[PDB]
Each structure stands twice: as C-alpha cells, then as structure tokens.
Amino acid sequence: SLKKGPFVDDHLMKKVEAQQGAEKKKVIKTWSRRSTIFPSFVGFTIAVYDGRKHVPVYIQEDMVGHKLGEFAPTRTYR
Template sequence: STKIRTLNLQGRKTVISTWSRASVILPIMIGHTIAVHNGKQHIPIYITEQMVGHKLGEFAPTRSFRGHKKTDKKVKLKRRRKS
C-alpha cells in the first residue's frame, strides 16, 4: 500500500511484485500492475475497478488443469480379454 501511494504521488506505473495472495485490492490500486506469486512464478495482473474488494490470489491460479487422462483403447481391450 505504501509503494502504491508513492507511485501515485510520483505519477509512475511500475510492476509491483508480491507474495501476499491474501491482500485485499483497494481503490488506490486501480490502474497499477501487480505481479502475484502463484507458487512457481509471478503473474502480472492489471487492476481494474471490478476487482476492488477481492483478494489478489483470486486472479493468479495456482493449479494448471490439463484435462483428465485419456485412456488407451488398446490397453482397455487387452484387460477385458484377460478376465
């Protein structure tokens, strides 16, 4: 919050890195880009009016879902024949 206040006074916009996913987005943060850590890397998030009141962690997902494992049909047929 103090970093954002000083940037607002100076009129500068720089990316601010943070590990605090539980921080609430305040109105003074609008227009800034905050890089939120997701456990592996910092994900840059541009703050808009609709985000005020939410937590920073809501916009930096920690898990990457790649879909359910596809089953191989050949292996499935072999298993059925054995039983």
C-alpha cells in the same frame, strides 16, 4: 475480522503508496495473497505469485471484492 475496509501489508503498502504517487509499473515479488483491493488502486499493475512465477497482471477498473491472488491460480489445471 477484516471488516474495516482496506488491508495491504506494510512493506507492500509503502510500495503501492509509492505507486500511487508515480506512474504505474508492473512487478512486485511478494506473497500476493494477503493484500486486499480497494478503489484507490484503479488501473495499476502488481505481480501475482501463483507459487511458480510472479504474474505481472494489471489491476483492473472494478476490482474491490477480493485480493491479488485470484488472477494466478493455485492449481493450474491442464
């Protein structure tokens, strides 16, 4: 029941709203699992926390179909 488009939680959503009005920084130390991606975020960078360390990784040009937690894996197979 998240069919109503955008979903970024509040004390991350105000941070990324402040990112929309300013120039694109990198690191946010947060859950990085819940906030979904939607096309007003093209080109940004928000740190994705795998569980070990946050991964400051750039938000791409064509990401809408998932959330932050696809960049950093949850298993890190090697």
